[PDB]
């Protein structure tokens, strides 16, 4: 499942990209496993959950770069994905 394989992959190199643009290590970890443009919504959601959860004008900048993360890793961005959960 998407939530089963999201634990195996170490997304920490991808979380390191915050403020770097505001390397290939993130895409190297992103390929595994069975991420044929699937479960990328869970992976992208996990990055938002780990760093700067919820909505500061800098998480918004981080949101734009996260959406472009699949493009630089030779992947298509998720079609159905909700990065922000207000919870109220």
């Amino acid at each position, epitope marked *: 499942s998407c939530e089963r394989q999201v634990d195996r992959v170490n997304l920490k190199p991808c979380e390191q990209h915050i403020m770097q643009r505001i390397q290939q290590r993130c895409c190297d970890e992103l390929n595994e496993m069975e991420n*044929t*443009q*699937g479960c990328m919504c869970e992976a992208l959601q996990q990055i938002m959950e780990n760093q700067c959860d919820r909505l500061r004008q800098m998480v918004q900048q981080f949101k734009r770069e996260l*959406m472009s993360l699949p493009q630089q890793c030779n992947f*298509r961005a998720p*079609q*159905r*994905c909700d*990065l922000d*959960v207000s919870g109220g």
Partner: antibody, heavy 121, light 103 residues
Framework: QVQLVQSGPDVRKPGATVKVSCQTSGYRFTDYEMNWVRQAPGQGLEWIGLINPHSGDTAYAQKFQGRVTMTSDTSDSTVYLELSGLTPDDTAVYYC??????????????WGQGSLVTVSS | SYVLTQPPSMSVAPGTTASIPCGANNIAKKRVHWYRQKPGQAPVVVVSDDIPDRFSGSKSGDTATLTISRVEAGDEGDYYCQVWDSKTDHVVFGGGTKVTVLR
């Protein structure tokens, strides 16, 4: 030129199963998810379900769960809708819509011609 | 069970501005798209959430309104508002709004 071509009108007996096809061309298949929308002869649009040709994942509406099955064939770039247990209320024109969007944005840009399936004995 | 409520019908004088409401709970947080369906034809999207046209969308507060500037004879038809719910992974369509141009 994104083209969506559907099957012709079908007449099925009540309680039977109907299969509606949606041929796609002009765009890269398995790159955009596709949805099925049905419209009663005098009523409004009703969303049935969702299919992702790249992954095979199917997202159905709560009402249609257990009665609808969606299949995709990347060899001919087609999306199929299969409704089981046909009731007289199911007679409607069935549309297939191509979805263009990323993350929160999700909308249909290339609707199909529609298939008027009539459930009657 | 995300419900989108739309007026059943609307009559607009020619040359004036039209406003079709679409009311759901906190619809501003969601993305609202409007489709226009001529009778006997597949619906056609008039406004979407990412050249100017007479059709535009505001999406402020609990209700989202579609505005048609300078209503003409060709603007008649049924207009539908649709959003993608996240809490249930469902695509929901609003009720049919039959727009009639006064003559």
């Amino acid at each position: 030129q994104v083209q969506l071509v559907q099957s012709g009108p079908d007449v099925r007996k009540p309680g039977a199963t109907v299969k509606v096809s949606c041929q796609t061309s002009g765009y890269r298949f398995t790159d955009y998810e596709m949805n099925w929308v049905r419209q009663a002869p005098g009523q409004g649009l009703e969303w049935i379900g969702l299919i992702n040709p790249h992954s095979g994942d199917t997202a159905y509406a709560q009402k249609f769960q257990g009665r609808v099955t969606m299949t995709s064939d990347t060899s001919d770039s087609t999306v199929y809708l299969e409704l089981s247990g046909l009731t007289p209320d199911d007679t409607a024109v069935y549309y297939c819509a191509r979805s263009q969007g990323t993350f929160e944005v999700y909308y249909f840009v290339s609707w199909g011609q529609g298939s008027l399936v009539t459930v009657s004995s | 069970s995300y419900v989108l409520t739309q007026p059943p019908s609307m009559s607009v004088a020619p040359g004036t501005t039209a406003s079709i409401p679409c009311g759901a709970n906190n619809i501003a947080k969601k993305r609202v798209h409007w489709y226009r369906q001529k009778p006997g034809q597949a619906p056609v999207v008039v406004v979407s959430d990412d050249i100017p046209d007479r059709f535009s969308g505001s999406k402020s507060g609990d209700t989202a309104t579609l505005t048609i500037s300078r209503v003409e004879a060709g603007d008649e038809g049924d207009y539908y508002c649709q959003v993608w719910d996240s809490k249930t992974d469902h695509v929901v369509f609003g009720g049919g709004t039959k727009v009639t141009v006064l003559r």
